[PDB]
Amino acid sequence: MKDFTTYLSTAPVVGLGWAIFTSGLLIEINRFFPDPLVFS
């Protein structure tokens, strides 16, 4: 398990979790309060 967690700490995997967060956050930020252009 120590080696599995180490594999998960590689660059390709940590980047995959980052991408799901940033993309998931932005798509969710467009789904709610739809299509923003001016900021109030």
Partner 1 sequence: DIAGLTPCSESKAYNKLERKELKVLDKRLKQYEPGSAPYLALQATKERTENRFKTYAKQGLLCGNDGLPHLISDPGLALRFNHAGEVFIPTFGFLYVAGYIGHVGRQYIILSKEDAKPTDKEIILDVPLALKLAFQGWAWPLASIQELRNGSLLEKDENITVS
Partner 2 sequence: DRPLWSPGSEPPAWLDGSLAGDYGFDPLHLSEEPEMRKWMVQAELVHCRWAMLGVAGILFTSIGAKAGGNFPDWYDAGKELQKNSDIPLGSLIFTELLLFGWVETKRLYDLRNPGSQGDGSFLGITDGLKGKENGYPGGLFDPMGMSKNEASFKEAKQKEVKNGRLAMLAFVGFIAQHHATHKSPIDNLLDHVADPFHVTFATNGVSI
Q: Give the interface with partner 1 as residue ranges (CB under 8 A).
A: 6, 9-11, 14, 34-35, 37-40
**31 marked among binding-site residues:** yes
Whether 7 and 13 have beta carbons less than 8 Å apart is answered as yes
Residues sharing a CB contact under 8 Å with residue 36, sequence separation 6 or more, in sequence order? 30
Total residues at interface with ligand CLA (CB under 6 A): 11
Overall size of the chain counted in residues: 40
**14 marked among binding-site residues:** no
Tokens at 40, concatenated: 């109030």
Write out the residues near partner 2 by the rule CB under 8 A.
1-2, 4
Residues that bind ligand CLA (CB under 6 A): 10-12, 15-16, 19, 29-30, 35-37
